[PDB]
Point group: D2
Chain length 494, copies 4
């Protein structure tokens, strides 16, 4: 039961957020944000750059000073604030979901039932961690009392992507705020709206000025300014592998700020011959096509055992052909447009590459509508490991199905990648499930399911899919600076 959306949500926030106030870019420049469903401009947004980031960092540093309201605040109260923010987001759930769809393109039903639900669960999960991430009292040698204080890392720069606007903001703000840090966030230029509105809710919830600062703008400008800043203590980035390298290089070239990266992937979804056919087919479809295929851990490499290959392919093709593409605001729409023209073109280019390299086009392969950035659900059969569409992150509704014979074979082929964000295994066998989940080199291995995220469970990549983990208890590690205090005592006893 999803509330009727407002297909034309009003925009109340489109500037730079510093000290709980709205500012125009120092340059006074603005950039347009487009609605992918029509190709039309929604509104202008302040174009933050280096000078704006500088104002944001100073505000955050000021809010982080010893003795400030944010630093003195009870840990439990930080939890109270996070829950309040969640309550406020829930109050405006219908509006935010609509605005999310307008600027991103994903179906409103999904924005409401999935994106916003996950945002609420993430913030509420971390609210609980606020006063529970204990330090330790250590039984060190000699006559000493030794313990550790889990302090905030400090001024945290957070650069996020456009595929899950609200959710990426939550995954970042949740752990940072729970541990008492201050934030300078750089939202994606393609989807700045929903994040900016949430800043209004952050102010309404009671967060002190400067605790959360959002600077909308481009990457090489605002993004690089944050990564290279001399007064930013830590940076958390989610995006392409290419930019992740630039982020880490910026960190090492500047003040050696701490770094955590959540990059792309080319996750393998392995279907064994003993899998439940109907379930595997539907899950494999979801694994790749979810969120217009714009998911970091998308099952972009569907390995299917030769005994069930033919049947699996027929069913997969049928499902892809029945996948409804249209206006995201229509409750019947399963797939909306791609985020922008750049992604639109990049995906079409990959489809063309797939055709040239010898992959078998089974369905789709072209534009789905003359207005917007809609692409037909595309499925390639008989894909070989050496093919481009088998090695590069397409980030669109383009499925690759590969055939394999043995379990040893598939392990080597699945792990033969520079990526290692996620992986999946579909089987009814206990030993095969354990054998594969142990052998697969990925941050997350789903068994008989896919895209199962939980605020409780860690998520991150192996190899070049990133470093560090987000969500769960692990998501607090990167936002904590450990201090050891060793005190001389008259006589130590157990």
């Amino acid at each position: 039961a999803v509330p009727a959306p407002n297909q034309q949500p009003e925009v109340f926030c489109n500037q730079i957020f510093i000290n709980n106030e709205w500012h125009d870019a120092v340059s006074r420049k603005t950039f347009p944000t487009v609605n992918p469903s029509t190709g039309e401009v929604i509104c202008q947004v302040a174009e933050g750059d280096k000078e704006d980031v500088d104002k944001a960092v100073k505000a955050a540093r000021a809010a982080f000073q010893l003795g400030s309201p944010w630093r003195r605040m009870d840990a439990s109260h930080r939890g109270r604030l996070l829950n309040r923010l969640a309550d406020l987001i829930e109050r405006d759930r219908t509006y935010l979901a609509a605005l999310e769809t307008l600027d991103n393109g994903k179906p409103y039903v999904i924005s409401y039932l999935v994106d916003l639900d996950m945002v609420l669960k993430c913030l509420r999960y971390y609210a609980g961690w606020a006063d529970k991430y204990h330090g330790k009292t250590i039984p060190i040698d000699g006559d000493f009392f030794s313990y550790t204080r889990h302090e905030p890392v400090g001024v945290c720069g957070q650069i996020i992507p456009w595929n899950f606007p609200l959710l990426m903001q939550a995954w970042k703000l949740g752990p940072a705020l729970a541990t008492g840090n201050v934030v300078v966030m750089k939202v994606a230029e393609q989807t700045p709206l929903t994040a900016l509105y949430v800043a209004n809710l952050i102010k309404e919830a009671g967060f002190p000025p400067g605790v959360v600062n959002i600077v909308p703008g481009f990457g090489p400008t605002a993004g690089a300014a944050i990564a290279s800043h001399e007064d930013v203590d830590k940076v958390a980035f989610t995006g392409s592998t290419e930019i992740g390298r630039v982020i880490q290089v910026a960190a090492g070239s500047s003040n050696l700020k701490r770094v955590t990266l959540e990059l792309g992937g080319k996750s393998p979804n392995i279907i064994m011959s003993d899998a439940d056919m109907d379930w595997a087919v539907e899950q494999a479809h979801f694994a790749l096509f979810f969120n217009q295929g714009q998911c970091c851990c998308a099952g972009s490499r569907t390995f299917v055992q030769e005994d069930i290959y033919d049947e699996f392919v027929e069913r997969s093709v049928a499902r892809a052909k029945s996948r409804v593409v249209g206006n995201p605001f229509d409750s019947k729409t399963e797939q909306g447009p791609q985020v922008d023209e750049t992604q639109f073109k990049k995906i079409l280019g990959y489809i063309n590459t797939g055709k040239q390299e010898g992959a078998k086009l089974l369905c789709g392969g072209g534009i789905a509508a003359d207005r917007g950035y809609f692409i037909q659900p595309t499925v390639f059969g008989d894909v070989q490991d050496g093919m481009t569409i088998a090695k590069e992150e397409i980030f669109g509704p383009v499925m690759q199905i590969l055939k394999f014979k043995t379990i040893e074979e598939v392990v080597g082929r699945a792990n033969n990648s520079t990526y290692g964000l996620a992986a999946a295994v579909f089987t009814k066998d206990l030993d095969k499930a354990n054998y594969l989940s142990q052998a697969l080199q990925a941050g997350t291995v789903w068994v008989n399911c896919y895209d199962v995220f939980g605020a409780q469970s860690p998520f991150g990549g192996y190899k070049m899919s990133g470093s560090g983990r987000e969500l769960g208890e692990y998501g607090l590690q990167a936002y904590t600076e450990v201090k050891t205090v060793t005190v001389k005592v008259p006589q130590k006893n157990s």
Copy 2:
């Protein structure tokens, strides 16, 4: 690769161990310890009673005084001491294994390869815990600095059974010593020898006097004296459910000392129709017949799915018939005698009960030799839940095989018990394994295996099979007294 045993090991220790010295009982009384393989007396052992326990408790209390060598000793050094004890036990491995067999009756090969190996692995594991069981620094509300000190619980009374003499001693000493406690141990009257010799090694290792005290003697005397003592802070008991109740009542009646119990069981071993027949058969055999069937978590209720029942039974009977019973010192012996005459007769009474109640005797059922306490491997088929041999812990080589149809059925029947120490599931199906492991009400659930103990994994019972857990990190909880220190500070900051 088992060294030739000394079939008549010399006894060097047979008195009360207090303050790293050997004492006769105050009463000067002694009791005989018998060799179950011949029924002959090995030697006399000091019969400790209340007055002897009192001397041991005072010695322990003195060793636990603030400022004592044991209290001031670095946590890491306690670890060094435990590793030293392990090394000494390894030096005398061949001797201890032989002595273990002589007094307990289990096969020498098993004493050497299993019991002693596990003892070594238990002590070495806990040695590593000595300086790693951290306390916490807590982000409490207000201007305070709050933290916890994990202190030793104090004088720990440890009462152990006779089925695994050396191992039960290790499971008790390892965690207690790693956390800096002092001990007053009451070993079983049937097998006091090996534990007493280890006391010599404890002294040789460098442990301060009074840290470990051992009082051989009977239960209602020495055992009850420890459980009811006004100066014993904690008691850990391993034995029958009947005595466990007595221990807990004694604790409540005395000084409210902390209690942890490891009692009996009637563990169900579930064999699904899709299990590997050969494997399940051999494992089910081991699950019940191990250590003359004198194992707390023995799979005494073998549930077999109707479609594979007949074949499973035929193979089970054949294996039981081929099981070699004889002199424990003979390399070909799989099963030695029962611990003593009391157990010998108790088991025969159960076999008679099984015949009278209608269970089908498939093999064995009687005495295996005219000398010693040897009983033929016995297997009962078509056992029903209401039968005595299906509800009561037999503790002998008596196997119960029950038939079942559905998975929902077996769950209910397996959980329909006052016991809940362990359980096992044999299947190749992922979902069946996960379904059963979650549903079964047991402290340990083995999947496609049985009797897999690891110093790293906890062991304990649900319901009336005990309370608390031993082994792993959990094994330190009961030996730790938590102290909170909350300090007023000028101004708290995150």
Copy 3:
């Protein structure tokens, strides 16, 4: 800032709470609950006995069945429910505070600003734990996958005292519910009202029927029925050392249910010569007189160094004399009446004992009013260790001041007790503070403060002050049943 109270709050709940419904006792019997400020009957309350407890246990067991709404509920949702209950309690904060004062006697201002605040903080803290009390994946030896499930302990019997009605209920419900257990609570016969109203809010919050059941009644009847019940998995008791013993004996005599106890104390408050005089005097007053002296960890033994003894006593006596005693609803009242006539008389008997044993009566010592159960703030000087008022828990506004010379002397004198609930040290010296906090044998050691409780910090006693800990992460241990699952895998790898 305190809202004007309704000095005559209406009672809406006075029956037995089972399956979210109100029931009369099977016997139809009722008992009167008195207002200690007037000695008049507030109303009648259903007198629950064994048969009523049986209905409660069965309902709880039913709500705990595998596949039930409570068992299947997401852990995070349990957190949501706990936060909802907290919100409902805050909505009715003014009403609950008034009702607390009416039935207990403590000052309304304190009920509102302290009791209810602490209740809200306790529930909100534990709501955050609901989905974060992780189990473990263990690197066990051999080819196995070993892990632990942290399951609910089951049907939890919770028996609470009358000194902090709402708070004791919160301390019990918070951790139990956070971990997925079901509850059968027995509230104190002297103060059943507030807890019963909270049951209504529990139903309003959405908790499934049978998750929380409250049975008002007496101890030897309803209380003993819970402790001795064959289907109660765990019992948590807070009360006298005398009844604690009875509970533990009942547990051992019945089904060996797990037990945690929170008993009395005779907590020492040590004031060193270098302490801040004004601060120590005020805190020492609060340490003992708080909540009409009806506090488990009351600083009933005030040790003062000889060089500051005379001045400390003069100031303490003056503070005691200025302490306003009267109607709890009057904002100027610091101290209300004692809970009932039984306590009233017991305290008067102790004051007489103090006079007879040679303690110097400095002020007070008699009845403060003709109506109600008011006792004058009483101070005894030159108290000796052997005196009864120095060894037994008075639980009234009776202060004992003892003189001491050295720091070594006070450690021995403070530790020479069967109690060990709490302790405190007042000093400006780093070494003295560390020396004492380590040496003191108490569950909580406050430094330069007293009665500082935090939902984040554990609380419990050493020796006969109880066993186990409440609050903090440690508060979840007793409500968790650990299950180890060890699965055989094809080939284990690190």
Copy 4:
């Protein structure tokens, strides 16, 4: 009790260690390692470069393959191997200490009693962690079973400095091996000898070929090769801030390997007016002069309160003048030479800068001997925050004494630095100690002591002194790659 040293220990190892075998550099080139005490060449050492690192990485990768001896080895056995290595290092303690002194220059007595003792304590500590760094079982939403596997991070490149050759090797090998990783270590060109010999002991201990590989050589060559390698999963570096940046940039430019850094410092040692004069003076001396002043956390900024400044300075100057400089093998020597000519000159240059900037030279200031790299213990008084010697890491026996008035003042001045490795506070006041320890922006804050390291307590820097922590449990974080396994189950229950 120090055994007489062999002042001319024979060198047995001076090549590249790959696959438990000794190899010459592919280029066949060698470099000389000098004895700083005489300026003479000890021996030639294989000069490893990129090609040799490539051989090392491939061997490490091979040893890390799924199914290899190192991967299948029980975690507990990895602990057994670490303890064995520790025992072997202890067997050869006298020899290793002598060789440490010969190549590094530090006093033999210190090498024996401190360096080697700490090495032994580090390895034995981590040996215990091998099978205790548990993963988690998470109570995720929905019908799923979610858990994490704590897997080894992989091929770990470890680059270490020359100030503590053996110890730096222990701090790196202990955690890496405890968690099942493989290593390619690059020891300092100035002190390669001792580490190479330890490789012989690693082979003798039973560690599989390729698990530990050591490549002696220069930084821009061998070091850079490791940091930029496409198949190295993680790099741990200990050295200058300058090279730390190069390492992080190389990591971002190559394969985005994980990075942890342990850089330099300019640690403030604060002496309050109420400190114990004698103690503070002796500890301030040790704080700076330890290990010829070649300590990362050296107290290079001694802040002394004005009221005790003159007395503190007089005593400090007297202690520095009495400090015995000479042959490190002579028992009376407190200070040996600097590690090499480059450091020698760098330190002399800093002393010159101190004289030019206006700092008051109180003692020393020049060369202590005509042979070797000996520098007189130098003390500068009246140092100002803006002076070069007050901002840059000198790494020599040059002490800076600065005067201050208030506690608020010293906090600001102590924190006004790009470094933040450690700090110290000397005071008898509880409040001041807690105020300062909380306020100071440093990885380790010592109270009434200094240079107190424990294998149990974390060590690392804030700001530019590094990132991540070493030692303690935290030391395992960087050598662990978290994997989440989420399995669909029929029906999830608590």
